[PDB]
């Protein structure tokens, strides 16, 4: 789920 992007996630 765009692993590389990092940042907030809904999870």
């Amino acid at each position, epitope marked *: 789920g765009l692993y590389e992007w990092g940042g907030a*996630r809904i999870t």
Partner: antibody
Amino acid sequence: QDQLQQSGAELVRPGASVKLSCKALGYIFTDYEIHWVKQTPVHGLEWIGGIHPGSSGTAYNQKFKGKATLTADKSSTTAFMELSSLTSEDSAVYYCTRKDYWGQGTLVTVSA
Amino acid sequence: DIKMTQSPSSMYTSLGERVTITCKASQDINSFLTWFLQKPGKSPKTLIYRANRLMIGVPSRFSGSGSGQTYSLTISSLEYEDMGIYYCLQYDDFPLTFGAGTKLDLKR
């Protein structure tokens, strides 16, 4: 892996509801968050919220929580966003994004 | 919310020149910054993610930010294709918040 397709322009009356679609293609639907953003001349870019098509989790902005309803349909790999109790301040461009790639936009005009 | 402050608001540049737009976040956004271009009549195009990674496709004239709380997208040499409004976005936390954009126009 590819892209996002938004539904065409909506011309709705005040007091009414609308439902925008964000069909996703070329990747695994239930693995990537879809978020909903709103564009206007006054405020510019605004985030309405997000959905996780796989877990069904949702994150809303406090500005649109009483007016927005995010859903998703795995079978058709479409994100739904429902905007209710339409007011003249809901007239705008609504985008669905997967953060790296974006839909083209859905113009919604509320008018009496 | 994280007030995102993007300056300038607009700018007058010429082909060949070096552009710099800055993004300032009200907190440490842990390099969770994205840069993107709105070409008039079009849906945003992502250019740079997590502060400094160029999206695939993007030309290498485009380059990104810093860390901590102020970030920048530098355009080495300006090309016509690059005219649109630029926008930064933090995704460190919710809600997601955008900077107010920077419009680029050709100068005379």
